[PDB]
mmCIF file of C-alpha atoms and ligand atoms in Angstrom:
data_model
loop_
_atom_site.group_PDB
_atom_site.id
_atom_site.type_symbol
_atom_site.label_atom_id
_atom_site.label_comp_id
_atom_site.label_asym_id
_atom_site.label_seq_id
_atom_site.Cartn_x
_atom_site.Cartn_y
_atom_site.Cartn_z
ATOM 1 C CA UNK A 13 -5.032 27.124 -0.759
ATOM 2 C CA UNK A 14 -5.762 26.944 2.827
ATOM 3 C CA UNK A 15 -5.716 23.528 3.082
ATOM 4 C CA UNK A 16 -2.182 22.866 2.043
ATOM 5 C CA UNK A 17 -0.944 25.956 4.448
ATOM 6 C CA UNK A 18 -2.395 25.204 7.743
ATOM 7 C CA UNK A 19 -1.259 21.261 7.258
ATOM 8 C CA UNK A 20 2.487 23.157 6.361
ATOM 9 C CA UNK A 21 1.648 24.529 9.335
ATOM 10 C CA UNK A 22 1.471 22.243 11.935
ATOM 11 C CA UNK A 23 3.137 19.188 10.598
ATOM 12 C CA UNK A 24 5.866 19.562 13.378
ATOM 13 C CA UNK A 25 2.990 18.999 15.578
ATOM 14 C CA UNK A 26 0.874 16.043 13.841
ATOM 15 C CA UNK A 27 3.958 14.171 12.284
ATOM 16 C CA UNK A 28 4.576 10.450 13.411
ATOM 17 C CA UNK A 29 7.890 10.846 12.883
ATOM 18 C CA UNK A 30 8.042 13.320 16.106
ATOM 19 C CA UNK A 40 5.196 -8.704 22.427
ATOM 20 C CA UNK A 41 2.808 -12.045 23.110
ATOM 21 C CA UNK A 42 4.100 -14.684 21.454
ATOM 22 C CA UNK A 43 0.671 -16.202 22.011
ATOM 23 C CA UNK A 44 -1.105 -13.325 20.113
ATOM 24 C CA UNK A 45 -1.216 -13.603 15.738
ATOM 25 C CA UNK A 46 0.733 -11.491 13.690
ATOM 26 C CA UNK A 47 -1.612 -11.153 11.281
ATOM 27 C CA UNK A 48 -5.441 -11.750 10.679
ATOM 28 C CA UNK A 49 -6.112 -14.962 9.276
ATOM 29 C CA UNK A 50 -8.691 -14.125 7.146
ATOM 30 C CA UNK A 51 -6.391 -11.565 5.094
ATOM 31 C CA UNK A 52 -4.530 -15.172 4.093
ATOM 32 C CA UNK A 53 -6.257 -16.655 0.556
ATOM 33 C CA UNK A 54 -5.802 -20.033 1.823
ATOM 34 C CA UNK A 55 -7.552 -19.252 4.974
ATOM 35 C CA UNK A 56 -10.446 -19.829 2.519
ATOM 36 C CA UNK A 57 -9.784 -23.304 1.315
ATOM 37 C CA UNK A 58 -9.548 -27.028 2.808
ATOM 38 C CA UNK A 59 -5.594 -26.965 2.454
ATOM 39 C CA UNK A 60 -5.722 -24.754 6.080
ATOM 40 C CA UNK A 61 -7.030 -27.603 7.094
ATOM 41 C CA UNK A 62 -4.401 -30.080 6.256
ATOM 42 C CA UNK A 63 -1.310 -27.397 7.779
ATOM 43 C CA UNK A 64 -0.097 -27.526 11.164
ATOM 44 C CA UNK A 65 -0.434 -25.169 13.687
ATOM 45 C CA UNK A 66 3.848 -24.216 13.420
ATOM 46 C CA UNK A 67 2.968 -23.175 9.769
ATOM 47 C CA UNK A 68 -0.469 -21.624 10.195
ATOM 48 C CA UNK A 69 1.501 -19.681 12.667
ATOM 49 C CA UNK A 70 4.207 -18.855 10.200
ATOM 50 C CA UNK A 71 1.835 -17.800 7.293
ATOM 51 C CA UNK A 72 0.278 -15.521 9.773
ATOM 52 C CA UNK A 73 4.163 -13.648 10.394
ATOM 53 C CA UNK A 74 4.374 -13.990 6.149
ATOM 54 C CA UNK A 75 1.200 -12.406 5.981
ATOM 55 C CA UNK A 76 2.325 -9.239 8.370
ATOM 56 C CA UNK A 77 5.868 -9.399 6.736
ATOM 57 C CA UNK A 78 4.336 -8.993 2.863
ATOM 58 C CA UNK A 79 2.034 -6.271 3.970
ATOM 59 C CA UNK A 80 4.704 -4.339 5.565
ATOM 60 C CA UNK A 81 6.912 -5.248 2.255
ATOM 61 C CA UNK A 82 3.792 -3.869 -0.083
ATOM 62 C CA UNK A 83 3.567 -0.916 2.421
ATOM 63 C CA UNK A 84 7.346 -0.015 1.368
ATOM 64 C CA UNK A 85 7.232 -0.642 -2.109
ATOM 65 C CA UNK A 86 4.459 1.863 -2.301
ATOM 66 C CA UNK A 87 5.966 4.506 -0.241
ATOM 67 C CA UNK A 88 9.541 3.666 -2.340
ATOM 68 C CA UNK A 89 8.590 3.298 -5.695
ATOM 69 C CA UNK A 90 5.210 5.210 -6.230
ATOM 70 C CA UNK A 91 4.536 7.527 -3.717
ATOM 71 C CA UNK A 92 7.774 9.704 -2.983
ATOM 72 C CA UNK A 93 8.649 9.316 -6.640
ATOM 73 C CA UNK A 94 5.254 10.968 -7.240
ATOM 74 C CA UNK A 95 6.102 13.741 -4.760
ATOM 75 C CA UNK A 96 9.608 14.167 -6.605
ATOM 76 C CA UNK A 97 7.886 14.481 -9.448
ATOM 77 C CA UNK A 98 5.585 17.032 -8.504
ATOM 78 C CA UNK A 99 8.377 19.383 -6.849
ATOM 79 C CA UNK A 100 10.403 19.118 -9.832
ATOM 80 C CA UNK A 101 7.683 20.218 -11.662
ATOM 81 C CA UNK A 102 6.773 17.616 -14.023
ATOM 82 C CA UNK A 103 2.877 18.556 -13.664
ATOM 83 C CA UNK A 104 0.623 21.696 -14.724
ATOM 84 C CA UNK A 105 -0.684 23.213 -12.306
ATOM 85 C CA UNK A 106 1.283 23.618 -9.695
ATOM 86 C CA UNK A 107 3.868 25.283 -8.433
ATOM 87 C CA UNK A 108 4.156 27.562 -5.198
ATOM 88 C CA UNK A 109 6.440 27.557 -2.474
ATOM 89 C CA UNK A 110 3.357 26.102 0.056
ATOM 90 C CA UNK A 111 2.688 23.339 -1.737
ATOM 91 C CA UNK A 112 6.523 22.221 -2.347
ATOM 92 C CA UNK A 113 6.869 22.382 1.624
ATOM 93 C CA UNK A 114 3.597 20.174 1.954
ATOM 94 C CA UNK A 115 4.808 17.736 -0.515
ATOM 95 C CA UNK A 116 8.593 17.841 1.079
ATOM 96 C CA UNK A 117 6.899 16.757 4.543
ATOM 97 C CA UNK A 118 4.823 14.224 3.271
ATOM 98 C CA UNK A 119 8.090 12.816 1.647
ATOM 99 C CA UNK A 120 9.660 12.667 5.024
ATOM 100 C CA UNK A 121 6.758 10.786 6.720
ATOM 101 C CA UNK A 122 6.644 8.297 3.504
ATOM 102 C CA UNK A 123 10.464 7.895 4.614
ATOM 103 C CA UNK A 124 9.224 7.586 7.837
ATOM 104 C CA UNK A 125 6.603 5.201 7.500
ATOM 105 C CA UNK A 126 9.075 2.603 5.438
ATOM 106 C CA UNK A 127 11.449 2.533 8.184
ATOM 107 C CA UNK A 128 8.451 1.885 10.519
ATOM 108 C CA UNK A 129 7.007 -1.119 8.429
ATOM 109 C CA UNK A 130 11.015 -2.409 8.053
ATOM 110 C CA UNK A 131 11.062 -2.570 12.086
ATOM 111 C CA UNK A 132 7.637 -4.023 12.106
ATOM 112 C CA UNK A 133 9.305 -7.213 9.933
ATOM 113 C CA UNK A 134 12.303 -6.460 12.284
ATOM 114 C CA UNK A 135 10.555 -7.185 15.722
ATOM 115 C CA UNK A 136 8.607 -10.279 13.871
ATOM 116 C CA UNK A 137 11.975 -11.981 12.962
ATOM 117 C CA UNK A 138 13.773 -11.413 15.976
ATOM 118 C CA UNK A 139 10.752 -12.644 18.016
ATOM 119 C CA UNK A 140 9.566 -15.162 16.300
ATOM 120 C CA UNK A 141 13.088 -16.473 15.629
ATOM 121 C CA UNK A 142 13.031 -16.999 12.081
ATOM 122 C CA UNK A 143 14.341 -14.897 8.646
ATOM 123 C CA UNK A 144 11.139 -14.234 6.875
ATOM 124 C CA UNK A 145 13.525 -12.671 4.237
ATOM 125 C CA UNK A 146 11.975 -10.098 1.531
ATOM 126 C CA UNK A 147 14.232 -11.591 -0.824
ATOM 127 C CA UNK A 148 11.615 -14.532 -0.959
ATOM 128 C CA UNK A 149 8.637 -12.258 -1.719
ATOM 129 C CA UNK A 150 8.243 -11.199 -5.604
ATOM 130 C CA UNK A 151 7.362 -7.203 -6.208
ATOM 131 C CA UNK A 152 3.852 -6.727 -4.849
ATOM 132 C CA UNK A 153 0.877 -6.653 -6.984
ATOM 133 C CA UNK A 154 0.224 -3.015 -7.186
ATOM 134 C CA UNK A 155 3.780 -2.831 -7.886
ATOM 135 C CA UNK A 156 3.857 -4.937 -10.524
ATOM 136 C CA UNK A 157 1.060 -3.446 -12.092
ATOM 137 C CA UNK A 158 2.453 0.221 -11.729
ATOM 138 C CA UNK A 159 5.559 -1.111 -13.780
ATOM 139 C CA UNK A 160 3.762 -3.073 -16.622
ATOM 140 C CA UNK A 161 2.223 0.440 -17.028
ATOM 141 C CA UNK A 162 5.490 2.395 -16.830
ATOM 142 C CA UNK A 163 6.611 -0.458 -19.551
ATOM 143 C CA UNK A 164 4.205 0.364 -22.019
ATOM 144 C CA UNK A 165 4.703 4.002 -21.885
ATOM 145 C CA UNK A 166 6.008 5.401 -24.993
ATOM 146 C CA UNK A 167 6.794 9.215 -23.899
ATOM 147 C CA UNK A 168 8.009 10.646 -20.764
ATOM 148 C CA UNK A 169 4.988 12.551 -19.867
ATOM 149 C CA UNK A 170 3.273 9.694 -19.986
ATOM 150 C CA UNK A 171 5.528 8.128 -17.471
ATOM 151 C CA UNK A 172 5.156 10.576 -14.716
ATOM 152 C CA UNK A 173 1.325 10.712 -15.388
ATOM 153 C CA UNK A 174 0.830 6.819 -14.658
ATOM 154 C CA UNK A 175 3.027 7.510 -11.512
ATOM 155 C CA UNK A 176 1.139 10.160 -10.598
ATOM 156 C CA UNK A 177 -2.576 8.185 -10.789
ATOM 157 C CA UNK A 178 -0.751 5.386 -8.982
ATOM 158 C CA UNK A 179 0.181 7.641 -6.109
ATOM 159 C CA UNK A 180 -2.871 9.746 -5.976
ATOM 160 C CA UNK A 181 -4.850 5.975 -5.830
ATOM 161 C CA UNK A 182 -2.062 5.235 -2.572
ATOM 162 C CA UNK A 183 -2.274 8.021 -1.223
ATOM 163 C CA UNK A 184 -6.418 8.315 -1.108
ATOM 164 C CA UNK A 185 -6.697 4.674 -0.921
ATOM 165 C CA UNK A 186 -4.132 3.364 2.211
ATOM 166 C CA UNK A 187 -6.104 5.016 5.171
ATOM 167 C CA UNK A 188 -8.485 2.227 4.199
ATOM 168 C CA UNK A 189 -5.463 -0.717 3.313
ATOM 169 C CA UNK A 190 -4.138 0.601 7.031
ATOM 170 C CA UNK A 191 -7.903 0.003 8.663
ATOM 171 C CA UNK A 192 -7.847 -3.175 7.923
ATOM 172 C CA UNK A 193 -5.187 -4.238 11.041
ATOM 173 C CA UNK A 194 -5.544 -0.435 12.378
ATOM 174 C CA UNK A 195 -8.128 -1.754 14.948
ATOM 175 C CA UNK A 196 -7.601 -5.202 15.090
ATOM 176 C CA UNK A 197 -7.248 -5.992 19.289
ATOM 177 C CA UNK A 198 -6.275 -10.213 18.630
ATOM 178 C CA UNK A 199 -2.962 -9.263 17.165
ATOM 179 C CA UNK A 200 0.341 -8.145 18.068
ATOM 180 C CA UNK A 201 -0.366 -4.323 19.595
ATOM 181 C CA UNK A 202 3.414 -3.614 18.339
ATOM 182 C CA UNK A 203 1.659 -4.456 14.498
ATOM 183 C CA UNK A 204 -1.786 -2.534 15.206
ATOM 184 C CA UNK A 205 -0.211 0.289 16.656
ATOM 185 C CA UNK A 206 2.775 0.645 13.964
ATOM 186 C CA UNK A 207 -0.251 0.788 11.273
ATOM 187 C CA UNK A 208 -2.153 3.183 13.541
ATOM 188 C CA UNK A 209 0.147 5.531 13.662
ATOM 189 C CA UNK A 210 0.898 5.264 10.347
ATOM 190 C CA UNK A 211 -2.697 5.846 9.251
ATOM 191 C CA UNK A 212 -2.486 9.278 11.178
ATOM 192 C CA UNK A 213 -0.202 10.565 8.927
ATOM 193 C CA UNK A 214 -2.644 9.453 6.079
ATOM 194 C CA UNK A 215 -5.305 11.216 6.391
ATOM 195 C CA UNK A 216 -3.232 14.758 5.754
ATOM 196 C CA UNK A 217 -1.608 13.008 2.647
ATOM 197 C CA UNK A 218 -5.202 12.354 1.168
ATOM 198 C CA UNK A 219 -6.164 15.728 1.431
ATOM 199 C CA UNK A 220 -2.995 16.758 -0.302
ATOM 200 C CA UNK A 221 -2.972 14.127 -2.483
ATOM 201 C CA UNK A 222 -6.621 14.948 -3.879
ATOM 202 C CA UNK A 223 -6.140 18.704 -3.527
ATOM 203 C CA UNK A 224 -2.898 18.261 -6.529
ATOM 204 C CA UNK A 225 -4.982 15.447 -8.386
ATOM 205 C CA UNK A 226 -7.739 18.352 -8.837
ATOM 206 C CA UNK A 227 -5.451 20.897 -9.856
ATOM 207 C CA UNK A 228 -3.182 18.511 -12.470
ATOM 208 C CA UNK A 229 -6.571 17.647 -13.957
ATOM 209 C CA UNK A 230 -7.733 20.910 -14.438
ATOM 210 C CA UNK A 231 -4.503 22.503 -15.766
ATOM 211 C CA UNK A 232 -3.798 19.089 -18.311
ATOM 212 C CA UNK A 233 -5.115 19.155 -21.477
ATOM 213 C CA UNK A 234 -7.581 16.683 -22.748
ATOM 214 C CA UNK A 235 -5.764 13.905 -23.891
ATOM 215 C CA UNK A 236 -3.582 13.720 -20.991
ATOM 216 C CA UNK A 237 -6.254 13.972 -18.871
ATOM 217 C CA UNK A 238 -7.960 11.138 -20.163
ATOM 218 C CA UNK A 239 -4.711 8.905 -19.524
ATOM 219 C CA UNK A 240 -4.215 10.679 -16.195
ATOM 220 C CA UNK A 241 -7.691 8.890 -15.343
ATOM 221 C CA UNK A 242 -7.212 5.822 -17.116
ATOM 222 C CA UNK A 243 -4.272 4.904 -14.663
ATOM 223 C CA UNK A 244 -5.940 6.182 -11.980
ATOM 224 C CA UNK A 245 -8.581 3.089 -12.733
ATOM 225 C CA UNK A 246 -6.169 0.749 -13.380
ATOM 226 C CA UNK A 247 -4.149 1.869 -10.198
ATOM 227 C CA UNK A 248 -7.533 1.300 -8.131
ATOM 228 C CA UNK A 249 -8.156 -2.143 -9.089
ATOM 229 C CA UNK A 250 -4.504 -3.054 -8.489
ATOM 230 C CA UNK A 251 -4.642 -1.357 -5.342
ATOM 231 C CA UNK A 252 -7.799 -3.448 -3.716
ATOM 232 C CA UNK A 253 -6.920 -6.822 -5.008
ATOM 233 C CA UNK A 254 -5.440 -9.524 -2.904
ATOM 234 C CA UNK A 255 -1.860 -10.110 -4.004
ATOM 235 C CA UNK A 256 -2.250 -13.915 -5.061
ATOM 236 C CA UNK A 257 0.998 -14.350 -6.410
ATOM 237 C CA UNK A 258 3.171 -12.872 -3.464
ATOM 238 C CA UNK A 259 1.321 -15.732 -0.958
ATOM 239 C CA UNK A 260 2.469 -17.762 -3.831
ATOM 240 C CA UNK A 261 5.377 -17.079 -3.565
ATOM 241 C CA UNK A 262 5.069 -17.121 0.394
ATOM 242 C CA UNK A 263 3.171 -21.220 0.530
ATOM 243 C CA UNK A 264 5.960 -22.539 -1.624
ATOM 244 C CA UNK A 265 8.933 -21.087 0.565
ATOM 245 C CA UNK A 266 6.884 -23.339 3.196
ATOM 246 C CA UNK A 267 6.781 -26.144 1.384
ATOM 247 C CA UNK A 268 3.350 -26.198 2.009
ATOM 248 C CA UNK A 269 1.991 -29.496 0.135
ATOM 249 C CA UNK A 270 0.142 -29.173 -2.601
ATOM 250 C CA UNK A 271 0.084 -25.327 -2.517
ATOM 251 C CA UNK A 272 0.209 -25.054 -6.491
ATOM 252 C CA UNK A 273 -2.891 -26.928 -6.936
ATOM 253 C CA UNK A 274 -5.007 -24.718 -4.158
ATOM 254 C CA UNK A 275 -3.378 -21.571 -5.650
ATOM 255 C CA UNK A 276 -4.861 -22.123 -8.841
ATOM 256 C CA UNK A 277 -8.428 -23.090 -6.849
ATOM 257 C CA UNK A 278 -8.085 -20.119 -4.928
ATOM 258 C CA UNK A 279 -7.747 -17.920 -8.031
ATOM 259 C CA UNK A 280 -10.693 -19.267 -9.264
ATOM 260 C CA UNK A 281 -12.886 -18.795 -6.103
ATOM 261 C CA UNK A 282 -11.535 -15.719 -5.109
ATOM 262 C CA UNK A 283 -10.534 -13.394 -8.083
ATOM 263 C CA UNK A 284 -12.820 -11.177 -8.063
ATOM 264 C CA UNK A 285 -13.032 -10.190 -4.691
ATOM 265 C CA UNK A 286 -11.130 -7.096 -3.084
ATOM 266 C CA UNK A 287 -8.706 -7.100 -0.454
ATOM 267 C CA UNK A 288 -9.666 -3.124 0.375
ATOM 268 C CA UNK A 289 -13.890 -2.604 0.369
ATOM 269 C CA UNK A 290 -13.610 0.792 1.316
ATOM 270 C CA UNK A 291 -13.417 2.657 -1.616
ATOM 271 C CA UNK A 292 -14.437 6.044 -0.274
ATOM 272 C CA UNK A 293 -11.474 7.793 -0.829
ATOM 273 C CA UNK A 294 -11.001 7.339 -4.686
ATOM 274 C CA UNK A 295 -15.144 7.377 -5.069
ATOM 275 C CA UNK A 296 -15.371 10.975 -3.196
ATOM 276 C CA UNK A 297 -12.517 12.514 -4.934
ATOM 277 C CA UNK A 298 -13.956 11.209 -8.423
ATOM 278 C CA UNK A 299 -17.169 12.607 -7.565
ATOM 279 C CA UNK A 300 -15.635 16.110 -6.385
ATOM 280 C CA UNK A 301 -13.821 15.742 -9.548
ATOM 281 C CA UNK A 302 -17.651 15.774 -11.798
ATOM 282 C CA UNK A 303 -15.741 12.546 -13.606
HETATM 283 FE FE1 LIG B 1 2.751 6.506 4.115
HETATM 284 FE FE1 LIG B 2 1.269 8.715 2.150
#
């Protein structure tokens, strides 16, 4: 597979891993509550402060994917939990990608890091619940009855991250209102992306292909289910986030917001997951 040995090749070269307190943190419309009359009733202190939240929980989501679905995924794979396979090339690939992941989490920690220390304030993770897509991945993993089903619904989850965050990155990649220390931490982690993607799909392909059918029915079935956890807004972690505030009457507006806004997606770009799906024939 010459795609997985020319990246093996020149990851030494590629790899990432080798402040205006009047700008935002964060883009306001990324906020649920942006979208209701309750913004209009909150200072401009807290609007400010939901705006760090709002950076500090997407660096936190950013994490728990890389921690807790993506490099257990890669594990996974070079410990050879999947058909398919194997191959010294492909264990290298997957071995640099875990170091970036690695990379990239201590990246989005120092993003939350520079927001605390300049904005003088804790913003503590210990306030934020498990992310949505985190969540999700677990009530999955909790209804799993066999092991190989287990490392299957990690593996759809990953493959969805991995194929899916160039497009969750985009969204402050490019942004020039807020804080270039924020855009250009998710810049340069979206370079990295791209190659993960590729190898990503390239060992989604090949599992597929080598499973038999029942497994690769439930490989796909979690791949869905990964998807729409992936793209939605995380409601309950701005939850979470308005009632650390002591935002008034956040409860009532939550459950408005639900209403008006589940539904919608977070992440539009679905290009990723659509492509590989149709290079799949599925
Ligand atoms: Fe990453
Ligand atoms: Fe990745």
């Amino acid at each position: 597979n010459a795609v997985i040995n020319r990246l093996v090749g020149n990851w030494h070269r590629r790899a990432a891993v080798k402040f205006d307190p009047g700008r935002p943190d964060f883009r306001e419309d990324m906020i649920p509550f942006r979208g209701h009359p309750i913004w209009e009733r909150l200072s401009d202190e807290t609007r400010s402060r939901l705006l760090s939240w709002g950076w500090v929980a997407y660096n936190r989501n950013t994490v728990l994917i890389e921690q807790r679905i993506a490099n257990p995924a890669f594990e996974l794979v070079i410990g050879g939990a999947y058909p398919g396979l194997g191959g010294q090339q492909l264990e290298l690939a997957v071995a640099q990608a875990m170091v970036d992941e690695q990379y990239h989490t201590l990246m989005h920690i120092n993003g939350s890091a520079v927001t605390r220390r300049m904005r003088r304030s804790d913003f503590s993770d210990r306030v934020l619940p498990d992310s949505h897509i985190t969540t999700i991945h677990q009530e999955h993993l909790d209804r799993c009855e066999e092991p190989w089903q287990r490392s299957l619904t990690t593996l759809g989850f990953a493959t969805v991250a991995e194929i899916s965050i160039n497009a969750y990155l985009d969204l402050l990649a490019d942004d020039q209102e807020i804080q270039v220390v924020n855009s250009t931490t998710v810049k340069l982690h979206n370079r990295d992306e791209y190659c993960h993607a590729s190898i990503s799909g390239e060992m989604m392909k090949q599992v597929y292909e080598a499973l038999p059918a029942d497994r690769r029915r439930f490989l796909l079935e979690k791949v869905v289910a990964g998807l729409e956890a992936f793209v939605a807004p995380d409601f309950t972690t701005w939850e979470s986030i308005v009632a650390f505030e002591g935002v008034p009457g956040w409860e009532k507006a939550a459950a408005e917001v639900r209403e008006a806004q589940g539904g919608t997606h977070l992440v539009q770009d679905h290009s990723g997951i659509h492509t590989l799906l149709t290079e799949m024939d599925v």
